[PDB]
Amino acid sequence: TSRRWFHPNITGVEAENLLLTRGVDGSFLARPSKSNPGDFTLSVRRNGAVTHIKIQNTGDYYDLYGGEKFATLAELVQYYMEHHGQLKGDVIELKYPLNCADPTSERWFHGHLSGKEAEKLLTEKGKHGSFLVRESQSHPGDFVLSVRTGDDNDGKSKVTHVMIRCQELKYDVGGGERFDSLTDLVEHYKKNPMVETLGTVLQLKQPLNTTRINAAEIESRVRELSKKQGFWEEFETLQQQECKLLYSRKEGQRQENKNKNRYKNILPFDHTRVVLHDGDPNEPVSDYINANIIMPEKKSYIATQGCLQNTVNDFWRMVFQENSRVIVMTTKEVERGKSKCVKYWPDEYALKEYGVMRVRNVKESAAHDYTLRELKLSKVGQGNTERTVWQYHFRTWPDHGVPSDPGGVLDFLEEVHHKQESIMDAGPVVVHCSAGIGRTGTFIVIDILIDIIREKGVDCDIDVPKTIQMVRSQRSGMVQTEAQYRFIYMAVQHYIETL
């Protein structure tokens, strides 16, 4: 429910002193790493001392040093808080989250925002119950809560401002309880709304949205985010909302399915996973594959992992069952000496049987950025089930970070979109990388946003963090890093500029 153990604006020394003076043995927090930008550090207190554990994310997963790989920091913390002797050669316990007081990553916090700008934003894009917290422009250290109430400009709605005083490190609205953080204050008055005289209830229903913008304003917004809502503040605000997406992944945790996962803790949500049917009645569990349906709001997607040698047959069962006609692979088979995906397709002009499924590689066409493989997929023993599956194998995604220019990705996705659109009643587009959350989520999110612009031009609303959060509700940790977050903005900006 909460993610208060993540401190966005703290240093290693500040983490140590915070755990030593305000924590106990078993207390812990997470924080960004300043020695390795883009990475993170888990700081845990033990025996009166603090240990720092490195968590690196190059774009595919959160790699805890000496631990396991996870899709989100919340799923990481959730894993070790219920599994006692996993984290370590001495064993380490995650017992008490040390809660952050910084309101930086809260959706309703907007920092240095004037009272007139707050009224303007709430006027133009706010609804009944839309609220925000801003710094007081007159009293430094104080804050203002601005809420919109009314019926959903004729005076039927209004904007009310509530002063938040900071008195001896505590916050209050002029009376009642005093809170140790703006988060506790906001949470309290969401549960117990303020009622002014004459009966108006100041309902804190939803934060003010400042990320949804018109498509033509993307270039301006990217310029604002590149130099106090920046890229980091917006991304980390979205990251805080990952704690609402801790849905069960019990099917992927079953004993019969552990070896079907490339990474044992990066698993599909039960409620969106692709369930395979008509499996072998002798195999006890034959319905599982590490893959999720991704629906926008239009095409749909299957986000999945790179095949293992023992999941190739299930991969083709999935492609056949879901009537998929296009596969997007955004990784080499080997990258930096590490195996990311086994070769699940035949050589050119060759024919292979993968279990009950038969695949012919009809022709390969090589572009600079990608290779296209025209495959015929059919069930063995049934010559009436054949259908063409077009595999688009993106080859030039860099080993480190994201592409410096999105033109290769955009031309790639444009070709994939038109191939899919030209096939009547085609199923979802299969997208995969290694773990199937990082590059895969980035490609899918860009494709979703570009499809909106392709049909609506510049006169359409797009909301990058809202789209990512909606996609993240269907597969764990879709879009992994801030570099990918920035790349999505730049690809959308580049696509608009070439309209």
Ligand SMILES: Nc1nccc(Sc2cnc(N3CCC4(CC3)Cc3ccccc3[C@H]4N)nn2)c1Cl
């Ligand atoms: N469903 C859904 N829909 C839309 C968005 C989201 S996340 C999200 C992402 N970004 C934002 N803002 C608003 C809050 C700020 C970042 C910009 C603005 C600001 C200014 C100064 C200092 C810090 C901050 C951040 N606190 N809100 N929600 C989600 Cl989860």
